[PDB]
Structures are given as structure tokens and as C-alpha cells.
């Protein structure tokens, strides 16, 4: 993996993070408070990094050499550099919302949220427990343990070939689609944390990639790195077409689905389905007249097989 | 409309707003954090005004002359002056809760919430899009467009005569009741935003004023400019009379209804009905034993016609 994490690199990273903070306090950006909110995320990430350092008082050599922590720190440093490049190389299109540069800052925001979530899953309370992480579906737990043991983080290639023995991937293009879905921190590493998220979202394990095919790859309602405010904004054009709906990953309850939909009374509501898989929510909502037109489209996929 | 908005007037307004802030940090007031909270509202309003100015860097002449923005700024300035008068001309009855002066500060609070909401609807992201605002019910959309085109804001008189051609108003007293309901920012102007709120609340459009007659004008459960904390406080006297209920506009989800009710287990709960109009919620809740005694009264209106 990347290099060992010393004090010099943590104090560089914070200085990068504080630069992204200053950039992001531009009033022309019109940043709204809702998650994911980069103005809370960077400060919160520093705080959890303070926590880790504090509990590794003495044992810095152990922490500095930890594999996950080295990959994490590199991801964090790379992403905060991408955000600084994005502002600089975007000059004034950062301010026109629905410019590409601006969509790119929202996507980073989400990535900064997914990274903080992963770091807290792996280091709850500032201490490394990647090696005892609990994978939430038992079959998926068995897969990881048989393939990688108690490893916290594995390169994409090695993950893809392990997955491929049990759940065959059809092609190069399907594999790249798969990668973008799972690899929430976008760093070409698959964590036990990102694996947990993906197999909870696309359970049951016994048909994993067919489930991911129907709900994401071939479904017009699925929306990849979208936020709550983006879903609301996207549905506005269908305000007069009750039953229009889209769905995505929840950013604050990672592992759970969030469905957005236009009601018959002129509201745009967002829900998080409980005690039922997305399929069943989608089927029943169609049957009850709520989830009819995915992304405002007139046909809806028949998930009833 | 009012005068053009220059730098001198924005810096006056902020100075007024900061005076209301200082007044409102009196510990004798016992202000609670819940929405609507004047201590978050004024600061937030400044922030969105910072945002607007920032995106009109250069084009101040365009912004300064915008019709809605001129009316807004006047409303904001008038209301912050009323609040300063209220403290000064209230001397020490501001501190006795359930004094009139104190109820008047709560009502202003709500008004400051409704204004901020209108300003964000009309200037989402700091840019003026009153002219493309989406009215949420299609019929109501047609009405506005046929009557006023793409105007953002119209004087009450002109609004009343337009409404009156399609939905006849019975009398002067009914017209004044109507005005107080719709005119959420209390400035004798009806925005496309306030119109949207009113027709979402009292839909369907085809019986608009009968709907507003049954649910507000003649219903003992309707409560005009009340907050969540006021509803809770008002229901306390009926704590031992399960089924007592009141309803009002939600302040944080403008356009939606919030029902307050005393349960059979000694709780006071507040709900926001979804995928059904207030009528249906009221009828079904009566039939299921939840919403029985409006404002603790023994008879309940029969909405089942």
C-alpha cells in the first residue's frame, strides 16, 4: 500500500483540508446545510483523526504502519487535492449551479461523507478494529472471511477475481459498472466496510449481481452519486406528474435505500424503506399507485420476477 | 412598488436586524430553540441576503430594481422595526408569557420564518427565478398564469379581484379572513410563493373557498399563526381528555398541515399528514378515535359532505 503515515503527512493533510474549507465558504456557492455538507465533514474528519492520534499516543509506529490507515490517509489527501484542483481549474463555473464543475463538487461532498463513515466504521472510538468488523449479512460474511480472512481492505483486482469465482461477472463493462457502485470512496480499494454496504443494499447474497442488475444497471429510477437535495431538485420537473419516482443510496444511513416521489397533493417526499428489501417496496408502491414512473418515464420495469 | 434597493438600505436593514437579535437574547424571555427561532432566523436571512448580493456582483442595478426584491426588502425592514417597537413599547410585559406583547413576538417569529421561506423559494441559490416558480397544483398554476402571467408578486386588491372572478368571495369580512390566511408575510402583497402555499393547503382548486371555509373559517380546531410549542402548550389543559385535537400550518414544511392531539396514554403528539388531504385525515382520525374534540370542544364538525 501507500507510504507510512507520520506527523509530517497528517499536518500536510489538515492544511489541505483547511484550504478546501476556505474555498467552500464562498457565498457565491450557495451551499445548503443538508447532508452531505462539506463544511461539517472536513472539521468532523479532523476531529476523528484527532481522536485516533490521541489513542495511539506512544504507539504511533503501530498506527503509522496499519494498512487501512495508510490507504485511508492517501485517499483523504488525494480527494482534498482534487477539490482544490476543481476550484482552481473551474475559475467561475463553480458558481453556476448545474455547471459540471459544480456537480463535481457535490459528488466530492458525498465522497467525503462516505470516507468519514468508513473511517468511523473501521476506527470506532479512535481504535482500529477493522479485523473484527461485522459484515451484516451472514453469507456475505462467510464470503469475505473465506476469501480474505480478517483483512480490512483489498485492491479492486483481487476483490473482482474473488467475487468472480462465486458470482460471475459478465464482461469488462459490467465490471466497471460494479466497481463504481461498490467503490464509494473512489480509490480502487474495496473495504470490508464498502463490501458490507454493497451486500446489504443488494441482498440477498444468493442472487447478488442479478439483484444489482435489476435495481441499478437496467433501472431508470436508480440514481448513482445523488444527494437528498439533488433528488428533490430533479423531481421538480415532474411536480405535476404524481407517481414519478427515483431512488438512491441514503448518505446518512449508509446501507439503506432512500426513495424520492411526487405525491398526488403536490408534495415531494423522501422515505427510507424498513423491514423489506427495495424490490418489495418498489413492487408494492407500484401496485398502490405511489411509485409509477421512474425518473418521470412512462414505463416501469416489472420486478415481479 | 417601494423604492430601489441600494447598499445604504441593506446596511440599514442589517443594523436593524442586529438590534432585534440583541433584544432577543434577553434571558428573561426564555426563548426555546424550536422553529420558529428568531435567533437562527435573522442570521440566516442575512446569510441568504449575503448570497444574493454576491451573485449580483456587478449587476446590482438589475437586482436593486427587481420588483419582488424591493417589496421583500421593505417587508423585512418594516417587520424588524415593528419588533423593535414591540420591545420598547412593551417595557416589561415582554417577559410575562401569555402577555399580549409576548404573543406578538411569537407571531413575528413565524412571520420572519415565512419571509425567509419566500425569499429562498424566489431566490434559490441567490438568483432570481420568481418568473419560473412552479405552482404545485396544475389548476392553480393555470389560474396564476392566465391572471398575472409570470409576475412574482401582486397587490392584494388585484389578487382579490382576479380570484373573485373564478372563486367568488361572499363579503368584505370573508375577504379579510382570506387575506389574513394567505398573506403569510403580512405585507398586503400576495406572492406566487404564498399563492402556492394556500392552494396546496386548501386543494382541490375546484372548491377552493368552500374547502377553506370548512377547515379554517368555521372549524374550531384550526389555529392561525400558531407554532409547535404553542400547540403543545394549548393542549395541556386537555391532557386528561384523550381525543382533543388542533391543527395549523407547519412552519418548517410550509404547504403541509400539522395536527396536534392528546393520546389515550397521556402523550401530546404532532403529526404531518401524507398522501391524503386534511379532510380525509380529519374524517378517518375521527372514525378511529384520535381526533374527536376540536380545541377540547365536545362537538366535532361533520366533514363527511
Amino acid at each position: 500500500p501507500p507510504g507510512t503515515v507520520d506527523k509530517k503527512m497528517v499536518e500536510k493533510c489538515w492544511k489541505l483540508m483547511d484550504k478546501v474549507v476556505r474555498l467552500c465558504q464562498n457565498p457565491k456557492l450557495a451551499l445548503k446545510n443538508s447532508p452531505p455538507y462539506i463544511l461539517d465533514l472536513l472539521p468532523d474528519t479532523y476531529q476523528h483523526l484527532r481522536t485516533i492520534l490521541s489513542r495511539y499516543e506512544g504507539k504511533m509506529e503501530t498506527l503509522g504502519e496499519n494498512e487501512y490507515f495508510r490507504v485511508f490517509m492517501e485517499n483523504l489527501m488525494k480527494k482534498t487535492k482534487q477539490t482544490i484542483s476543481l476550484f482552481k481549474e473551474g475559475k467561475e463555473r463553480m458558481y453556476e449551479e448545474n455547471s459540471q464543475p459544480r456537480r463535481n463538487l457535490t459528488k466530492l461532498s458525498l465522497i467525503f461523507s462516505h470516507m468519514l463513515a468508513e473511517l468511523k466504521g473501521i476506527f470506532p472510538s479512535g481504535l482500529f478494529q477493522g479485523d473484527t468488523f461485522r459484515i451484516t449479512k451472514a453469507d456475505a460474511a462467510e464470503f469475505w472471511r473465506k476469501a480474505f480472512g480478517e483483512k480490512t481492505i483489498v485492491p479492486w483486482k483481487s476483490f473482482r477475481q474473488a467475487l468472480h469465482e462465486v458470482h460471475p461477472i459478465s464482461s469488462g463493462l459490467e465490471a466497471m459498472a460494479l466497481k463504481s457502485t461498490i467503490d464509494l470512496t473512489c480509490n480502487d480499494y474495496i473495504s470490508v466496510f464498502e463490501f458490507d454496504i454493497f451486500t446489504r443494499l443488494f441482498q440477498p447474497w444468493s442472487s447478488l449481481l442479478r439483484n444489482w442488475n435489476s435495481l441499478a444497471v437496467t433501472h431508470p429510477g436508480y440514481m448513482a452519486f445523488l444527494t437528498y437535495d439533488e433528488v428533490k431538485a430533479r423531481l421538480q420537473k415532474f411536480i405535476h406528474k404524481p407517481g414519478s419516482y427515483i431512488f438512491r443510496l441514503s448518505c446518512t444511513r449508509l446501507g439503506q435505500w432512500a426513495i424520492g416521489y411526487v405525491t398526488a397533493d403536490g408534495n415531494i417526499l423522501q422515505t427510507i424503506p424498513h423491514n423489506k428489501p427495495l424490490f418489495q417496496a418498489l413492487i408494492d408502491g407500484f401496485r398502490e399507485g405511489f411509485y409509477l414512473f421512474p425518473d418521470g418515464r412512462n414505463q416501469n420495469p416489472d420486478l415481479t420476477g | 412598488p417601494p423604492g430601489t434597493v441600494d447598499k445604504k438600505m441593506v446596511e440599514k436593514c442589517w443594523k436593524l436586524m442586529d438590534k432585534v437579535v440583541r433584544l432577543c437574547q434577553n434571558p428573561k424571555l426564555a426563548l426555546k430553540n424550536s422553529p420558529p427561532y428568531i435567533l437562527d432566523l435573522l442570521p440566516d436571512t442575512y446569510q441568504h441576503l449575503r448570497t444574493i448580493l454576491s451573485r449580483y456582483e456587478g449587476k446590482m442595478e438589475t437586482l436593486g430594481e427587481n420588483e419582488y426584491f424591493r417589496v421583500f426588502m421593505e417587508n423585512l425592514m418594516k417587520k424588524t422595526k415593528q419588533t423593535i417597537s414591540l420591545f420598547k413599547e412593551g417595557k416589561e410585559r415582554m417577559y410575562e408569557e401569555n402577555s399580549q406583547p409576548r404573543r406578538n413576538l411569537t407571531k413575528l417569529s413565524l412571520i420572519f420564518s415565512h419571509m425567509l421561506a419566500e425569499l429562498k423559494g424566489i431566490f434559490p441559490s441567490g438568483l432570481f427565478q420568481g418568473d419560473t416558480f412552479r405552482i404545485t397544483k396544475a389548476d392553480a398554476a393555470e389560474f396564476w398564469r392566465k391572471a398575472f402571467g409570470e409576475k412574482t408578486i401582486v397587490p392584494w386588491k388585484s389578487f382579490r379581484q382576479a380570484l373573485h372572478e373564478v372563486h367568488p368571495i361572499s363579503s368584505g369580512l370573508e375577504a379579510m379572513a382570506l387575506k389574513s390566511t394567505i398573506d403569510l408575510t403580512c405585507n398586503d402583497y400576495i406572492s406566487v410563493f404564498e399563492f402556492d402555499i394556500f392552494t396546496r393547503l386548501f386543494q382541490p382548486w375546484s372548491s377552493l373557498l368552500r374547502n377553506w371555509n370548512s377547515l379554517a373559517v368555521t372549524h374550531p380546531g384550526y389555529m392561525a399563526f400558531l407554532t409547535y410549542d404553542e400547540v403543545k402548550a394549548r393542549l395541556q389543559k386537555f391532557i386528561h381528555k384523550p381525543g382533543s385535537y388542533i391543527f395549523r400550518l407547519s412552519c418548517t414544511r410550509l404547504g403541509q398541515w400539522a395536527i396536534g392531539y392528546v393520546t389515550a396514554d397521556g402523550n401530546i403528539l404532532q403529526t404531518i399528514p401524507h398522501n391524503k388531504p386534511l379532510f380525509q385525515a380529519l374524517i378517518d382520525g375521527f372514525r378511529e378515535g384520535f381526533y374527536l374534540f376540536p380545541d377540547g370542544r365536545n362537538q366535532n364538525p361533520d366533514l363527511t359532505g
Binding site: 417526499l269 423522501q270 422515505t271 408502491g285 398502490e288 405511489f290 | 404531518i272 398522501n275
Partner: peptide
């Protein structure tokens, strides 16, 4: 935090 409401009616 954002507004998530109960599944539809």
C-alpha cells in the same frame, strides 16, 4: 438532518 417520512400510505 434531511426529512425522511414514513413509507407511502
Amino acid at each position: 438532518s434531511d426529512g425522511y417520512t414514513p413509507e407511502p400510505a
